[PDB]
Amino acid sequence: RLKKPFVKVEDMSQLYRPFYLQLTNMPFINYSIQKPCSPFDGYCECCLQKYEDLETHLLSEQHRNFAQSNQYQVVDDIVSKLVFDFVEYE
């Protein structure tokens, strides 16, 4: 079936879908190429949504709602554990 060369990986217990690699050629160790060359030479977690423009997603109301909520208390809990030792200016 599969055109060569190929690599195929599957889970022995059906947990994953099979996946594949096919290239023109398998990796070849190239000792002739000079050092240091290799011898072989978005989504928002907060809103649980794929976005197209970071800046515009950030400026959306659903992102604004999450950003200005109690959700970062987990971060503030740690920060309150740290000593501030910089000089602060007004």
């Binding site: 160790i29 050092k35 240091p36 072989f40």
Partner: protein, 312 residues
């Protein structure tokens, strides 16, 4: 430059504390700035401001912070001075460690410097592993090295996960990569590349082996691959396709490969690629770090006891 101004705007409190000079890092999850601040205690200090992408979940941000707070500041693991937040904008402040580019120093390290580098990487890995942190992104850009000062720092816990019995509480709430946040394919262990559900601290030891491989062969990046299976194909060409298939069976993965390729002798591989008197213990340690079986792969603690590191 507009980045500097927009960092100030997103986190106004930074204005009162830091003179932000330069942008010294960028990745998909963070930008890093170099800054100057005054310490209450007296001197000025150079500071690294790590600005996390505002899309990161609070749990992910908190987890990295917690790794820095709890495990860091000791044994070549970066620590944290403070952390600043306005809303979804979170900036971690760390001591700035001036460091070499890995490429630039690669072909100029003495062999003794290569031993020290590795010894110091294993101290950091030992530290984090005692806390049950799997780093998941060990590679030269996350291991900072100051050649002049002989100073070393493991950074970047943005991809970290917890072992089953992790001491970092927040890491329990971090979605597993195999369950659901991907590193550089070329530093990822076969059990990561094959999406093994069980990924232990052993994956970090593999990555240290890849670094060690670069050091011994003078080639960086050694595995140059844009995806996981290409890196796996390249690993098979080094460690042998038969040997890789056998080992993968032991962790519940079945690999089929078109061309059978033989395992390479590590010494001859590195020597042909690349000091006059590299001991056998170096290639023996390398062989253990690049153990295809994650159960038998050497641990950070055992690595520090390895004959390669007598007497240091």
């Amino acid at each position: 430059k507009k980045d500097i101004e927009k960092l100030y705007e997103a986190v106004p409190q930074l204005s009162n504390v830091f003179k932000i000079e330069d942008k010294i890092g960028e990745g998909t999850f963070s930008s890093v700035y170099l800054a100057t601040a005054q310490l209450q205690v007296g001197p000025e200090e150079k500071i690294a401001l790590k600005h996390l992408i505002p899309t990161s979940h609070p749990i992910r941000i908190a987890a990295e912070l917690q790794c820095l707070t709890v495990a860091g500041g000791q044994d070549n693991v970066m620590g944290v001075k403070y952390c600043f937040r306005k809303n979804d904008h979170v900036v971690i402040a760390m001591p700035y460690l001036e460091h070499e580019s890995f490429l630039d120093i690669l072909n100029s390290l003495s062999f003794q410097e290569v031993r020290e580098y590795m010894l110091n990487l294993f101290k950091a890995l030992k530290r984090i592993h005692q806390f049950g942190i799997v780093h998941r992104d060990v590679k030269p850009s996350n291991f900072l090295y100051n050649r002049r000062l002989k100073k070393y720092a493991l950074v970047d816990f943005g991809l970290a996960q917890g072992t089953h019995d992790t001491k970092i509480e927040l890491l329990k709430f971090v979605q597993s990569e195999a369950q659901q946040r991907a590193g550089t394919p070329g530093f990822r262990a076969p059990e990561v590349l094959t999406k093994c559900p069980n990924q232990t601290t052993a994956i970090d030891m593999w990555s240290a082996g890849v670094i060690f491989l670069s050091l011994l062969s003078g080639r960086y990046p050694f595995y140059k691959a844009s995806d996981d299976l290409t890196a796996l194909a390249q690993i098979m060409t080094i460690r042998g396709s038969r040997e890789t298939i056998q080992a993968a069976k032991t962790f519940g993965k079945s690999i089929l490969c078109s061309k059978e390729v033989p395992a390479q002798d590590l010494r001859k591989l590195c020597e042909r690629l690349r000091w006059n008197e590299v001991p056998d213990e170096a290639y023996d340690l390398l062989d253990k770090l690049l153990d295809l079986n994650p159960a038998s792969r050497i641990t950070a603690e055992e690595a520090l006891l390895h004959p390669f590191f007598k007497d240091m």
